[PDB]
Symmetry: D2
Subunit: 330 residues, 4 copies
């Protein structure tokens, strides 16, 4: 029988996760919890200003029908203690609200049938896994973190380039689309930079790169750091790695080491663009990272710059469900 | 009054004491406007923002630029002519007390008490008047230059919407010149904090959609609003709004059927004439072929686009006018505070 | 029964759209394209669009293009219309999409040998003008025609429908329009000092000859309708806004019904209705000349109504281009 | 000199006479900058725009706001300290004659003569010096505050790119403090007039794509540019640019490997220290947590983002800095004109 999952929270990642899971034959969405009215949640699933239209229907009994999940229960309960996925016999939760990004909080989902919780974000005191990077070290933990979108795109490249060349140090900048933690106009915010209109401004913003890499590539954590700059695009982001290696490198050798890993250890996770595309071309791309082959450069013997695209919504949502598949069986 | 005397203030020569409630877009702009009026003193601001964030947001604006503002050793703000602004942070209107700073008039800018019943909760001790920065249930409504002269000491009023402040003066002028039989109004409007940055939950499933990516039709009670300030015209006018991807500055589009015949010439004349007389400082004319960004921080309720006036079939005209939905409206707010404090 | 052999002149926005539309029409064969772009660049642009998405397109060994049902597209690169010879691929009809030959005199230069018919992707001086579903049945074998502007294609249907139902006494049009390649990215030289200003930052009023356009296709209504455009910071999809005075009384209900009805009958596949409260980005790539916004129809007094309608100013119009190519090849 | 005397000008006390060639973004900004320098006189502008359009574009800017400019009865422009600007409209550089107005120095802002050979065609009679508003083949290159003191009377010079004016000072300061071993540079850059509004033909198939919708990686010759102004560092630095949907204001991102050990503290100290001394008026520090729009019209070649400096692994640092790619660069252009007119 398909793996029975429930989606908690229907903002950006919630909506993407639904749409991704709906296209996986080996998955069944049995429930969704949404603070949106039912009709609104349907509307939002169907119609996206960035990703386009999607086929979704309502059954007479007021369940949703989307691709291979034909009987989705819809719930609307903010309080996690009253929320009961058991009712639909959910095995695994993808937690997408942003309000329970900790081990303590998200454990509350574990009840009758519910045995596993994947958090759509970094999470306090929470074992953290990134498909293709350290996911094979999964050992039946009941509550995990799928990390940030930026780690899913950065950690692969770091692994690959470390295994090929040994990373001594690296600096990361992510040029990131604006997300719902930002403001439409200049108003109150706990961060006085993200207070400012997202669509008008370049907005530097601190992001815990060292800590993130520590969880999934511990030997590299103390050697890598960086930051983010939020920019006026609605989706699709760009990671910019500046790396110092132990072994000498060239444009050619870095290119080769990346292409090779896309054929082997990172098939379906990392890709290469040779066609000189731009951000909008990666809307809805399933990859954790698409390397920008023609812009790879080196300087001196040991240093290189590597760029890669990632759809911070869909790429990550693909990985969410990939990981659901993976931990349902292992 | 003893608190006035203790601070060396003479109540008889005193500037008009106002407090600003809410420090979002309109609160912020109202602060900036009032700070530059010599006859006004902002004596208190209530803000859910951290103090230092409030300061920051006053000082720096992605659209409007930089503003001089300081913080005094005692945690009061110092901006222009308002050197001792008490800052509060109390969401509960019943616990909030602007009497402490001897506020006469409240500029209500939260968007949460847009009703006679709700905003009346402000009235205590020194506080006698309340101007709501939006349309408001069961609330006497005034628009500067349209019907503000009918004001008769009401203790809680509404300053209408930004669109009504732009549309009503135009409607009045053109009605008095040509008699409006009917009119349809579209406002092409900058996006506001009423909207969403990305596609997510909202009670209106249009405004649920990403504000910076979409044209977004949206219903707005034109007939009702006009009824309040120009009652004869209320039954004759209606319209809607389209939110578009600009952060500020909006455009009102009037398509009018008149009783008397018109030309482009005669419509231009009637509008310019009114800008010199009954609407000096409220309505203006643009003859310089400007675009939306040129009107950032314009003080006018409306700026007519003189070259794009068109008429057809003897009786019909299209009239466009710019307005800075934030600063023009805020200018009127404080104009109204000056007005109701004295008259 | 062999497919109608067409060539596309110019590969900017409409050119690219027209290629992609025609490529999906079984009854059409694109035999040639003329492009000032390098071949590889034209291919790149056909394949990848920041608004409309990816498109399957290939290059054959011989350096022809292969796209859907047009498998051998000759690719030319000649700017001078006199030296350009579409006869070499046996083209019957030209879709003129450069913007540089929008007149009878100029575009006539395409007529040689196999080439008998020219559809201009824009208004055109002294040029018989036709709008699918509006006056296209009055086509009488003219060899050079105009497919009007994108705004006329969206406005004229609505005007016809509402006229036939209620008798239009007067109407005023505003189109809230996406920016197009006649605008500037930043504040710089332009013959129109409003379109000189940065397109992505500004609301930009701009003069559009509505009366004249409607005169060509709905002559009785030309002297009764006029309006203007406001260019706005969106890359595609526009919005027409009609304020109408009628002879016969109307209601929200009656205007709605008259419009729904015409979508089922005289304007099937040309006009549509949205009842789902969508917004602009939802109509990206929509094939319709006009999608009425049902819920926002309003009336005031007895005789007056406002009507809004969406239109993808690129694709909607490009659909109509090829519709008209089909229509004049046979009639 | 006879034309000077006829107009009541004393050649021995006169302001430095410059002419501006091309009135796109940098031309326009250069006009506004120079107009406000008392030691400068703009004596001529050559513009492909219609005169009245040029005036309009000087006066009104969607990003930079409004500017005072007048047209004199005789068809000369009158802006700040430059009251009799001759306006020309001649695309052919060999027919253009800035001698007519007794220009000493040409600011070359068309983007079409970025080479020693091409721009030399300016040199006739009174015109002795040419500053190219871009990198330029076979052209001595100078960046104010980096190597401008090596200037030795060259008649044609390049003011480098906007990115080199921001990057080079930072590289110099940090090199002199810590020795740069290597560095990688990304510039997140506002879109410019070499890009497309919509997806259409371009020589670079990335810049072919809509500027307002896309992040657009783009190759920029960093090593070559640094080589010219800081030769020891040329072989040690490289990088690229990413064009993004903002109309103005850009961000340079340096990732540096040093010989001496560093901390956030020590990098901050070295940068601030330089801003007080060797780079007063050229480099600055932002301690106020600002964003891109706050630096519109900033005069500095670079503004360091003090709070976002990071270091790791003893030797490595990230350093960000804002720059207004239009006004910062334009400020330097005219600083250089002042400099080479005298030294
Ligand atoms: N690119 C990305 O978006 C991205 C990538 C990776 C990770 N993440 C992470 O994903 C999390 C969510 O981000 P997002 O992009 O999806 O933001 P979002 O669009 O704001 O999604 C959060 C949604 O959760 C809803 N919600 C909050 N509390 C709820 C509850 N108790 N029950 C049900 N729904 C609830 C909110 O609705 P209300 O308004 O009703 O509260 C909101 O619509 C964050 O931790 C973020 O860091 C995001
Ligand atoms: N163009 C315009 O923007 C415009 C023009 C004319 C009229 N108006 C109207 O004026 C009103 C204000 O709009 P706006 O654009 O300024 O909205 P806004 O930017 O969202 O500002 C509203 C602010 O009020 C605060 N607030 C809410 N409840 C509060 C309370 N109890 N005490 C103190 N502060 C509170 C909110 O802070 P929290 O987020 O912490 O709750 C928010 O920062 C609305 O009704 C609007 O329609 C707007
Ligand atoms: N929404 C719309 O875009 C829309 C809708 C309806 C009608 N139209 C009309 O369609 C026409 C074109 O609009 P558009 O948006 O497609 O224009 P565009 O995006 O500017 O593209 C026009 C193209 O024509 C090319 N061109 C010019 N002269 C040529 C020649 N002699 N041979 C071959 N190619 C040539 C140009 O190439 P170069 O760059 O090499 O000069 C350019 O790429 C205009 O009249 C416009 O009004 C547009
Ligand atoms: N932030 C920046 O934009 C920036 C910063 C530093 C350096 N630069 C460099 O400075 C140069 C100018 O850039 P920009 O942004 O100002 O570009 P721009 O906006 O395209 O300005 C160049 C102007 O020169 C005009 N022109 C072309 N040939 C001419 C001629 N023969 N005579 C007179 N005018 C002529 C063009 O008008 P027509 O359309 O009539 O040809 C155009 O308006 C470029 O090389 C650029 O890379 C730019």
């Amino acid at each position: 029988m398909p793996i029975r999952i429930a989606i908690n929270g229907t903002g950006r990642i919630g909506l993407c996760a639904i749409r991704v899971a709906s296209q996986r034959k080996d998955i069944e969405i049995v429930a969704i919890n949404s603070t949106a009215e039912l009709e609104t949640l349907l509307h939002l699933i169907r119609h996206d200003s960035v990703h386009g239209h999607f086929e979704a229907q309502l059954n007479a009994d007021r369940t949703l029908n989307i691709g291979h999940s034909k009987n989705i229960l819809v719930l609307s309960e903010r309080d996690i203690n009253k929320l009961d996925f058991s009712a639909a016999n959910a095995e695994i939760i993808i937690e997408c609200t942003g309000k329970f990004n900790s081990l303590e909080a998200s454990s509350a989902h574990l009840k009758n049938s519910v045995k596993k919780v994947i958090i759509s974000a970094p999470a306090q005191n929470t074992p953290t896994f990134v498909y293709g990077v350290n996911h094979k070290n999964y050992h039946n933990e009941s509550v995990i973190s799928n990390a940030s979108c930026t780690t899913n795109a950065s950690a692969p490249l770091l692994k690959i380039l470390d295994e090929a060349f040994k990373v001594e140090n690296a600096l990361l900048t992510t040029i990131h689309s604006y997300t719902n933690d930002q403001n439409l106009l200049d108003t109150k915010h706990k961060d006085i930079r993200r207070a400012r209109a997202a669509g008008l401004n370049l907005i530097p913003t601190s992001t815990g790169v060292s800590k993130a890499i520590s969880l999934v590539l511990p030997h590299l954590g103390p050697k890598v750091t960086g930051l983010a700059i939020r920019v006026p695009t609605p989706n699709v982001s760009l990671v910019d790695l500046s790396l110092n290696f132990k072994k000498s490198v060239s444009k050619a050798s870095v290119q080769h080491a990346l292409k090779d890993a896309c054929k082997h250890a990172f098939k379906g996770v990392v890709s290469i663009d040779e066609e000189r595309l731009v951000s909008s071309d990666f809307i809805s791309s399933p990859f954790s990272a698409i390397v920008i082959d023609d812009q790879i450069m080196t300087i001196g013997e040991k240093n290189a710059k590597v760029l890669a695209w990632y759809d911070n919504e869909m790429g990550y949502s693909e990985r969410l469900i990939d990981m659901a598949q993976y931990i349902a069986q292992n």
